[PDB]
Design brief:
Rossmann fold; metal-binding (chains A, B); homodimer; 3 domains; binds 3-(2-methyltetrazol-5-yl)-5-(3-thienyl)pyridin-2-amine; eight-stranded mixed beta sheet; alpha/beta; magnesium (chains A, B); about 40% helix; DNA polymerase, domain 1
C-alpha cells in the first residue's frame, strides 16, 4: 500500500527540461546530432558534470570545463564550432525558460492533501551565476509544497547511484513498496524499480498522471479547480511594532518587493487574508497582513476613543515610520476598507495605492448626523445594535464557535438577517445553537478565530462602530479633497449590506478610479472567491502599484 | 530658562527653500520680478495656497488653481507666459532638489541629547503627486529625530495665525519663555516673539546656529563629528520565525529594498548592529538584524550539535524560505562572519552578496585536525578554553556586567590577553572586579546585553566553538569550490585575534574579492568605528548588491 510520492525536478515538476535545450541548440545551429549532449555526459561518473551534480564544484566553475568538452567533441566529429557560441548563454536561456509544470504540482498537492509524504529528488547544481535568483525563486515556490527536497549537490550523491535511493528511503521513513517514484530518465528510474518502488516514466504529463492516479487510486486528472495556497499560522514570520506606550500592532509578513498592507474587517484577523498572502508574495510583493487594533495579537485597549479613525490612521502611519517604510499599498475589507480610504484622504504621501473590497468610499454628509445616515438604510441596523456598550459583546462572546460559524457563510447559506436586529434583540436570535459548517471554512479555521478572540473578546472590535460622531467631524475636514492617487474599488454581487450600488458615485471623489467586480460573492470576499480576489488584486498591483 | 527648540522645515531643516525656486524660475525664464510669487500668495488667507496649507485641498487639486493665478498675474503686468511652462514641473524639481540641511539637524540632535524637547512646525500640504514618495522619505528621515511634528495641513491652522502658536505651546507643555523658535520667514517669527518666545531669523545656517548656541549655552557649531543614529530596542519592529519545532529565530527589521541579513559574533546581539541598522535602511535596504541561534530572543537549545555550521546554515535558509525571500545579502562579524562565508559556499543561490567584518575566509586544512590548527596559533587559545562544557559558562555567567565591560573595549583600553587563557585559568583572571566603562559603550548599552544574556546564558553561544571536528568534515566537501558571487572582506588594523594578515590568501578562493580596511579599529568593529563601517558597507552594497 502506497503512502509516499517522489518527483524529479527537470522534465517532471519543471518544464521544458534543461536536456531538451542542449539538443534544440544543435538543431538550431546545424551542429552534429548529440554533439552538445556528448560534451555534457563526458567522463561519466568521473567527468565535470558528475562533480558539478555531487557539489564538488559550482556551475560557474563548470561552465569553462563544459566549453572545453565541446571542443574535444567537435575535433573528433571533424566539425567546427561558431564564433559567437556561448555555453553560459545557452544555460541562462534554458533555466529562464523552465517554469513549474502546474498540473504535476497540483497532483503532488492533491496526494499530500490525502495523507501522502511528498518529496522532490533531484540531480542539481550549486548555482553562483549572476542570474541565480530566477532558479532560487522557482525552487522556493516548489519546495514549500513538499515534505522533503533532496538535492544531489547537497547530499554528495547522484542518480542513478543506489546510495541516493537508500538515502531517500531513510528520509521518507518508508519501505520501497510504499513509494511511487516519477522520473523522465529511465536510467534514474531503474534503481528505484530494483528496490521494489512503483515507478512512472514521465514523457507527457497527462499519461504520467493517468498512471499516477491508477496506482494511487486518487483522482488527480480532471479534478475541480483547486483553492489558492493558504497559510499555516505557525509557519509565518510574525512581526510586532509598539506604536505608542500601551499599543502594539501584530502582523504576518511574507515576500519581497513593494510593501502591501492588508487591513481586515469586523470581526476578523490577519488570517482572513490567508489565501491572498502566498499569492501576493509570489506575484512580487512584500505582504504585511495586520491584526488590526483590538484584534488577535495586537493590543486591545478598552476605551471607545482609542478606536476612532483619526487615531487608527495615525497609528498606521507610526507603524510605517517604525518599520522604516516611506509608503505601502493599502488594501482593506469592511472596516479595513473604510480605514484605507481615510488613509488615502489624510496621508496620500504614505499610500502608494489604495484598494477596497466591498466597502465603498463613504463621504461625510455635512447636513446629517452619522447616526441618522445609518438609520436611513435598513441594512445598517446591526451598526445601531453595536452602539450600546456590553450588549453585542455578551451575545458575540457567549459561544465563540457559534459566532464564527453563524457569521462566516457563503451567499447561498443564509443564516442571519441584517435588518431588524435591534427589534429581534440580537444577531443570532433566529440562528441555530450548533450552526452547520460553511463550505468556505474548515472546523480548524473556525477554531483559529475562536482561539484569537479568547484573548481580548469583542470590546475593541465593536468600539470601531462606536465613534460615528467623532469620525464624521474628522471626515468633514476632507470634504473639499479628492482621491488622486491610484485606487481600486472591488464590489461583491451578493454582499447585501455593502451593496455594489452603494459605490456608484465614487468617480465624483476618485475620478481615475479602477474597478473589479465579483459575481456570486458574499460579504466574506477573501474566503468566498479567493481565486478571483487574487486575480483582480495582482492585475491592479502590477499595472498601478509597480 | 530654555528647554524646547522649534524649527521650520522649508529654509531651516531642509534646503534650498521651495520659495527660492519660484523667484529663480522668473530669472531663468526672464519673467517679471515676483510674477510667480504673487500668483502663489494670491487671495491671502482666502486664496488657494492657504486652503492647500490648511489641508482643505491637496497639492494635485492646487496645481491647476495656481496655474490660473499665473495667467491673472501676467494679464495685469501686460506680459505673456511661455508655451512649454509647467507649474507641476517647477514644483517637482524644487521638491526633488530640496535636501536635509545636515548642520541644522545635528544642532537639533545635540539640543535633544542635552534634555531639550524638539519639534518641527511647518506650513506644508497633502502631497498626492505621482512623485510624493521623495518628500515622504525626507519627512520620514527628519521626523524620527524630533519629539513632535506639527504640519499645518494636518492641524487645519497655518503660520502666522496665532492659533498654531498656542497649539505648539500646548503640544510642547511649556511656557513661551522656555521655547526657541527658528524660522526663515520674519512674518512667521513675529507671533512667537509676541508671546515671549526666543526667536531666530534663519538666513545662512552658520549665523542662525551662532545665535542658537549663544541663547542655549550649548556648543552646536564646530563640535566633534557625531556618531551615526543608534537603535532604541522598544522602537523597533521585532520579527519571529519558527525554523523547526524547538527553534525560533528573532530579528529586528527596518527599511525597504533588497534584504540585508546581519549576523553578529560571540558573545553578541542584533544590538551589536545598532549603528548600522538606521544607516543601511536610509541607504535603501531592508535590514534584518538577527539574534543568532543561542542568543537574546532566539531559541537556545542545550545540545552542542545544534550549533554546528551545517545546521546553523540550514536554519538560516529555512528563515529565508519562511519569510518568502529568495535571497538576502549576508553580512557577518566574528562567528557571524564565519557562517556568512559558509552560506556563500553551500547556498550561493540564496546569497545575493556576502560581506565579512574581521573574520577572513578560513578554508579547511584536510591534512590537519581543526583542534591542531587552533593550537598552531597562540591568539586562538581562548577557543581551547571554550571547549570543556561548563568552564567558560561559569566564568562568563558569574558577573554579566563585568563580562561585557571587560570584553567590549577599544584597542587602546586592553583589558584582557587572548593568549595563555587556559594556563591563566580564565579570560578575566587578571581583569578588575569592577571594570571601567569603555568609550565605545554607555552604561545603558551594557545593561541591554546583561538583560539579554539573563535569558539563556552562555551555553548556546559557547556551543558555536564546540563543533570544530563536525565543521571541518563539512567544510572539506567545499574544498574544490570557489566563491564567485559578489564578496567583501573588511579588515580591522588592531584586531589582535582576527588579524588583517590572516585574510591575505583569500583571493585564491574568491578571485573577484573586494576589500575595505579600518585603521585604529579593534575586534568590536561595528561600535568601534561605526561611521567607517557604514561608509564601506553602503559603498559596496550600492555597487555590488544593487
Ligand atoms: C449607511 N451608512 N452611512 N454611514 C455609514 C457608515 C458605515 C461604516 C462602515 C461601512 C462598512 S464597515 C463600517 C462606517 N461609518 C459609517 N458612518 N453607513
Ligand atoms: C587558527 N584557526 N584555525 N581554524 C580556526 C577557526 C576559527 C573559527 C573562528 C574564527 C573567528 S570566530 C570563529 C572557527 N573555526 C575554526 N576552525 N582558527
Amino acid at each position: 500500500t502506497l503512502r509516499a510520492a517522489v518527483f524529479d525536478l527537470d522534465g517532471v515538476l519543471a518544464l521544458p527540461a534543461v536536456f531538451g535545450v542542449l539538443g534544440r541548440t544543435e538543431e538550431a545551429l546545424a551542429l552534429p546530432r548529440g554533439l552538445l549532449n556528448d560534451a555534457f555526459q563526458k567522463g561519466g561518473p568521473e567527468g565535470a558534470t558528475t562533480r558539478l551534480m555531487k557539489g564538488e564544484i559550482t556551475l560557474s566553475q563548470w561552465i569553462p570545463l563544459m566549453e572545453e568538452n565541446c571542443r574535444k567533441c567537435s575535433e573528433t566529429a571533424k566539425v567546427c564550432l561558431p564564433k559567437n557560441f556561448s555555453i553560459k548563454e545557452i544555460f541562462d536561456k534554458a533555466i529562464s525558460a523552465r517554469k513549474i509544470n502546474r498540473p504535476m504540482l497540483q497532483a503532488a498537492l492533491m496526494l499530500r492533501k490525502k495523507g501522502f509524504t511528498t518529496a522532490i529528488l533531484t540531480n542539481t547544481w550549486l548555482d553562483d551565476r549572476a542570474e541565480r535568483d530566477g532558479l532560487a525563486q522557482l525552487m522556493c515556490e516548489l519546495k514549500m509544497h513538499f515534505d522533503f527536497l533532496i538535492e544531489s549537490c547537497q547530499v554528495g550523491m547522484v542518480k542513478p547511484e543506489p546510495q541516493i535511493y537508500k538515502f531517500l528511503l531513510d528520509t521518507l521513513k518508508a519501505s520501497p513498496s510504499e513509494v511511487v517514484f516519477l522520473d523522465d530518465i529511465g536510467a534514474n528510474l531503474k534503481p528505484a524499480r530494483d528496490l521494489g518502488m512503483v515507478t512512472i516514466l514521465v514523457q507527457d504529463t497527462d499519461t504520467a498522471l493517468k498512471e499516477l492516479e491508477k496506482v494511487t487510486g486518487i483522482q488527480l486528472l480532471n479534478t475541480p479547480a483547486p483553492l489558492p495556497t493558504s497559510c499555516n499560522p505557525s509557519d509565518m514570520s510574525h512581526g510586532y511594532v509598539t506604536v505608542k506606550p500601551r499599543v502594539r500592532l501584530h502582523f504576518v509578513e511574507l515576500g519581497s518587493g513593494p510593501a502591501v498592507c492588508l487591513c481586515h474587517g469586523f470581526p476578523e484577523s490577519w488570517y482572513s487574508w490567508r489565501y491572498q498572502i502566498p499569492a501576493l508574495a509570489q506575484a512580487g510583493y512584500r505582504v504585511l497582513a495586520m491584526d488590526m487594533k483590538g484584534y488577535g495579537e495586537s493590543s486591545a485597549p478598552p476605551e471607545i476613543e482609542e478606536y476612532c479613525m483619526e487615531v487608527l490612521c495615525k497609528e498606521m502611519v507610526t507603524f510605517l515610520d517604525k518599520l522604516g517604510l516611506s509608503q505601502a499599498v493599502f488594501i482593506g475589507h469592511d472596516w479595513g476598507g473604510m480605514l484605507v480610504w481615510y488613509m488615502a484622504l489624510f496621508y496620500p504621501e504614505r499610500v502608494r495605492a489604495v484598494a477596497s473590497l466591498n466597502t465603498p468610499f463613504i463621504p461625510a454628509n455635512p447636513n446629517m448626523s452619522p447616526l441618522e445616515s445609518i438609520k436611513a438604510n435598513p441594512v445598517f441596523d446591526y451598526q445601531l445594535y453595536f452602539q450600546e456598550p456590553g450588549v453585542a459583546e455578551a451575545e458575540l462572546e457567549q459561544n465563540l464557535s457559534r459566532t464564527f460559524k453563524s457569521l462566516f457563510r457563503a451567499s447561498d447559506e443564509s443564516v442571519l438577517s441584517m435588518h431588524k436586529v435591534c427589534e429581534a434583540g440580537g444577531l443570532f436570535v433566529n440562528s441555530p445553537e450548533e450552526p452547520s459548517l460553511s463550505r468556505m471554512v474548515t472546523e480548524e479555521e473556525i477554531q483559529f478565530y475562536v482561539q484569537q478572540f479568547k484573548k481580548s473578546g469583542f470590546r475593541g472590535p465593536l468600539n470601531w462602530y462606536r465613534n460615528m460622531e467623532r469620525n464624521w467631524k474628522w471626515a468633514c475636514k476632507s470634504l473639499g479633497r479628492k482621491i488622486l492617487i491610484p485606487a481600486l474599488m472591488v464590489t461583491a454581487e451578493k454582499d447585501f449590506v455593502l451593496v455594489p450600488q452603494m459605490s456608484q458615485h465614487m468617480e465624483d471623489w476618485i475620478p481615475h478610479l479602477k474597478r473589479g467586480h465579483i459575481e456570486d460573492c458574499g460579504h466574506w470576499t477573501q474566503m468566498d472567491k479567493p481565486t478571483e480576489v487574487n486575480q483582480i488584486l495582482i492585475k491592479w498591483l502590477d499595472s498601478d502599484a509597480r
